[PDB]
Design an enzyme around this catalytic site. Structure first.
Site, PDB file in Angstrom:
ATOM      1  N   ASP C 163      -4.719  52.429   8.470  1.00  0.00           N
ATOM      2  CA  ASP C 163      -4.729  51.784   9.644  1.00  0.00           C
ATOM      3  C   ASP C 163      -6.593  51.734   9.903  1.00  0.00           C
ATOM      4  OD1 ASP C 163      -4.609  49.065  10.988  1.00  0.00           O
ATOM      5  OD2 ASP C 163      -3.034  49.356  11.458  1.00  0.00           O
ATOM      6  N   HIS C 248      -7.162  43.297   5.618  1.00  0.00           N
ATOM      7  CA  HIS C 248      -5.688  43.111   6.828  1.00  0.00           C
ATOM      8  C   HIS C 248      -4.762  42.283   5.653  1.00  0.00           C
ATOM      9  CE1 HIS C 248      -6.600  46.245  10.477  1.00  0.00           C
ATOM     10  NE2 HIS C 248      -5.307  45.693  10.090  1.00  0.00           N
ATOM     11  N   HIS C 251      -3.712  43.343   3.172  1.00  0.00           N
ATOM     12  CA  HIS C 251      -1.658  43.927   3.534  1.00  0.00           C
ATOM     13  C   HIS C 251      -1.127  42.916   3.600  1.00  0.00           C
ATOM     14  CE1 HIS C 251       0.511  43.269   7.159  1.00  0.00           C
ATOM     15  NE2 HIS C 251       0.864  44.827   6.362  1.00  0.00           N
ATOM     16  N   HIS C 265       2.221  50.057   7.343  1.00  0.00           N
ATOM     17  CA  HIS C 265       1.512  48.719   7.644  1.00  0.00           C
ATOM     18  C   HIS C 265       0.117  49.302   7.484  1.00  0.00           C
ATOM     19  CE1 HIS C 265      -0.670  46.293   9.638  1.00  0.00           C
ATOM     20  NE2 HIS C 265      -1.627  46.343  10.005  1.00  0.00           N
TER      21      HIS C 265
HETATM   22 ZN   LIG Z   1      -3.610  46.700  11.612  1.00  0.00          ZN
END
Ligand SMILES: [Zn+2]
Ligand SMILES: [Zn+2]
Ligand SMILES: [Zn+2]
Ligand SMILES: [Zn+2]
Lengths: 357, 355, 356, 357
Positions: C163, C248, C251, C265
């Site tokens: 992340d 992101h 993702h 994540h």
């Molecule tokens: Zn994140």
């Protein structure tokens, strides 16, 4: 997507104006040749094909476009030829697109990026910017006679340096903003164009001073030749294939001021380039290095150098309103454009320049 | 003195083939659209104020095909010659347009050579032996590159393109050091040199990325950069700066039957590496070029162009054809003789086999 | 214009979960302390002022935001406190904004940038991206017990690195495209914000290998502490203050495939970061170095590392359509965004990674 | 092994934002006590669901004033303290907000110090002698920076801010080398975020200070000014609270015992004190010199004479040094052994070294 445009043929060689007719013949049967006032006589003498010679009114405005256009329809002209500075060239261009005629440009001075591009700029009769027309066709041939060009007063070469000076910096703005170039119909820049634009800046730093020194002394050298190509071929290829920005937009707005009317297109653009740098808040050392570079060739680097000395904040406010009209090229700048910002950039550049000795 | 030439418009975008008709209209009224065989059917569909006749291309730019195709233009009364294929199709079209006083539009379907942008057409014998590089008096009016069309072709063609583009900077440097003229031929313009140099950087930055992309059937910005470099950058550099031993050796290589099945750019990629040996460049520059060529799968040894038997005699033959008086290899900033050329080629193969 | 936002207080020390109340005291009188399920039993005991303790359900989705909210109203809740991973925290924040309660987050793993940010992300009850809520306040205090975070399995620390890794790269996308950040309705990034995003990358490459190896051997070292900070403080400040982008976004789009449901994540964002690079056509060396960096700590670098192996071109078509919905964060990328462009960037990255 | 960071919940920087300030208050309380600097009280009280009592600042942050404001707030039953002024207005507002349980909003009217962000309020005697630095438990809820308002002040206030931001990195560096705690939550080692911010602060000053100065002296607001406003407020504030102060703020504190220095801004003294830190730590000659030159480029003081200190200098510097070295003081965060002669002599040596440049 991406797209490139340029002239089919660029040729640069001393005496080439004597052989100019020999480039027309393969292109058409009927040639209208449009020649700046000062040199109308000797270059009519000197230049399966007939030529009408016309004398150029001095400004690229609707009335002259129209006059010359009417000349051409009657002539039945196959080919428009511009033999002058940028105003003459643009006029031949505009008349050509309107006619269906082929384009040839033979500059007599190297004072602007106009000869190679598909862009033509129209002013009012008082020389106030009206409109930049994105044409569909580049010229068929650009024929630069170096000896002719190097003979003009030294100030014409310096003014082209100042117009070419914008090229790399304004390409850099279009890359960072991802804005299109004017290559029809308008597209992202090509690697080819980016490279030309980058290289234009390099040629100027390497040769400008040496070239200015040489023309001042009535000489034609390899440095002068490099600068003629940088002022003409590299600059026009760059500006067309990469895009304009605030340097040119600021040139445009500067035209609302009468005090400025007697300075060259290239000297206003040079000053506008310095303002672009301050507007994008570039590195102090880069701004200072460009200021010193301009000073070293005699280009303006203060408002005062373009005759702007009374009521300056109010004038600059006018310059900025005109530059910032919705749709204008200045919006190619990777900054948030407001009139306060453009006005404050020009004034801040001026002040910062005034603090450098 | 100096001169620069290029096409009046170059446009590169996915889907453009379908809009090709619209770039013909401003140029004339009777277009002759010459298409490569594999694509004749499908492209004739999609291409069809303006009237088109479509012709099928034979495959070689040789006199029987040029003259055959010229007779068809004269009948149609064609205003516009359109090359729609590879560089042979393109060169065929260009030579007909000039003979016919028609305008020129090229729409490449592969990015395999630098032919689509230049004033240079190369004529081969009906067998594909080099005959003659014709310097034409005009460049194309428009080059219309359909990125999706080019990308969906088998990877080999983009790689052959990288091969051809690879000669650009190195040949320009050869010409700049001998002060020989670019191909309407003057010393190179600054624009020309800057284009050529940039071509090498785009290739090194993006070549492996593109290759990987096209091998997975993808179009990406790396592919688009390589397509531009293979066509616009390579083309403008070569015309505006000149060619050298790399294309000379290419041309010399054509005299050997067993090389016929290899792509122009595969031949030119090998010749570039021989140019470097002929000029005696840095060990490290040669090595890195050999390694760059291998990483995209371009040939770096004589055995990669199948030359494996009677090699010295054949390379002798290659050098003879390359070294005929007036040829392009004399642009090399070295004293060119048939032994120098023959031994550079062998030396390069020897050195390459040692890596 | 420019704006910056952050939590008021960020404290990071081993044992701090024992002192959590001391941080709550000044924030209110009544706290609802939402805790993940695994740790529900132990942490309630460990943790003047009275606290109801609600177990958290796993997903931050609306049915569960509403459940927790009702409890909060009933409670008369003054301070929402989130004790867990990113979902636990996002819920707690969402409830807090709904209630006008104060916010305290006490992460038990350092697996995402959520704890410091003003951003709550809602998924469907089954974990498909639904919405990125941009809230009007940052947390009042973020309290990080290093010992508790470092005791979690090594996989969770590596997911945080995953992340945090997107922070600099996505900041750079936003700067180059001049897109508004997520502070107070969105402004240009502050210098403070750009500096933090930048430093985030520097701390990660400096300390991520040493921290990974330390947590695998059961240790808490200064390198772990540095990574805990980058995974939490630097990465949250940088994200919120600089914006997100295609990493992101990708993702978010990946969330639509079932096979990827099992991955964290962070491992998804890590992969999305490599895709962003391919999408921007960044330098090969840079793409390669980030691939080697992802492998050296065990983060995914191929489609197969995410379970994606059958019918891949169609599945990436679907991830791309989802990512490329109008107004999505992926448009912050200084590139012309289309479904084909995004689809082929992920594919290209996959192919490029398969050749190393 | 422990770290901590604290900062404002929101920081907003935009021209004209003062008009919308009331809109930032609504969400934090119903009842706002707005405390404004003398000079702008009229104009700003009229520019600025919600009930506000307006109060003019006394102009010094001292007990009499704090108490007075504090009684106003209690009478009002204020929910929010808003300081609209310089660092004194700001710091008074904070102390009263903490005694009162109010929320805190700061709206600086000048960018002259790094007070607006931090949980540190400094108390002075009624006459301006340093008295106490109080570490508050809370940062502001909101910092609202109206760039046009700040940029229209006299240039001296922005230059003074730059002087105060100049210390941030140098003092973080002292604190990192002596491993001394910050002023977040009772005191913790610097977070990597704090260290990055402080370092970055210094890069922003060097890039933009000279261009910001030139601009505000011309009465302009450009992006350089915007950057320096952030550097003086957000960066310098986060850096200071998050990494600690040292001998630059310590020498400032000591300087205030001298009456003659009274008319000099906080930031002008801190600038000089930072140069003294560099000499005290025996830093590289070239680093001390480059800072001296940098102070001079923006017109910050680099010699004792610049603070008007020209008579009985050793004795006066003796007094400055005693006062800085009171036990417990922040000068003890310097990674040197701190004595009165060392500090006395670093100051004198810096002056003498600066007179040779
Ligand atoms: Zn994140
Ligand atoms: Zn121009
Ligand atoms: Zn070739
Ligand atoms: Zn201070």
């Amino acid at each position: 997507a991406r797209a490139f445009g340029g002239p089919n043929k660029y040729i640069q060689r001393a005496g080439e104006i004597d052989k100019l007719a020999a480039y027309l013949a393969p292109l058409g049967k009927r040639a209208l040749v449009l020649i700046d006032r000062v040199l109308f006589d000797a270059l009519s003498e000197r230049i399966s094909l007939d030529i009408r010679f016309e004398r150029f009114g001095g400004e690229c405005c609707t009335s002259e476009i129209e006059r010359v256009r009417k000349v051409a329809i009657e002539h039945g002209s196959d080919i428009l030829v511009g033999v002058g500075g940028g105003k003459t060239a643009d006029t031949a261009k505009i008349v050509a697109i309107d006619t269906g005629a082929r384009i040839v440009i033979a500059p007599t001075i190297a004072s602007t990026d106009a000869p190679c591009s598909a862009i033509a700029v129209r002013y009012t009769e008082h020389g106030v910017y009206e409109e930049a027309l994105r044409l569909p066709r580049n010229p068929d041939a650009v024929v630069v006679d170096s000896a002719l060009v190097a003979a003009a007063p030294a100030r014409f070469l310096v003014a082209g340096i100042g117009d070419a000076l914008s090229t790399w910096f304004e390409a850099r703005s279009n890359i960072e903003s991802r804005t299109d170039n004017y290559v029809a119909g308008g597209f992202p820049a090509t690697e080819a164009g980016m490279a030309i634009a980058r290289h234009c800046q390099d040629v100027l730093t390497r040769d400008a001073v040496k070239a200015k020194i040489a023309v001042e002394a009535g000489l034609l050298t390899p440095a002068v030749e490099n600068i003629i190509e940088a002022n003409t071929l590299l600059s026009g290829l760059g500006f067309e294939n990469c895009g304009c920005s605030a340097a040119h937009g600021i040139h445009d707005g500067l035209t609302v001021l009468e005090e400025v009317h007697g300075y060259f297109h290239g000297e206003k653009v040079a000053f506008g380039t310095l303002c672009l740098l301050m507007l994008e808040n570039r590195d102090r050392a880069e701004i200072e290095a460009m200021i010193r570079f301009c000073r070293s060739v005699g280009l303006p680097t203060k408002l005062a150098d373009l005759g702007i000395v009374d009521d300056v904040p109010a004038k600059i406010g006018r310059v900025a309103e005109a530059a910032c009209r919705p749709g204008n090229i200045i919006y190619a700048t990777p900054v948030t454009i407001t009139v306060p910002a453009v006005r404050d950039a020009i004034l801040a550049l001026d002040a910062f320049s005034r603090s450098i000795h």
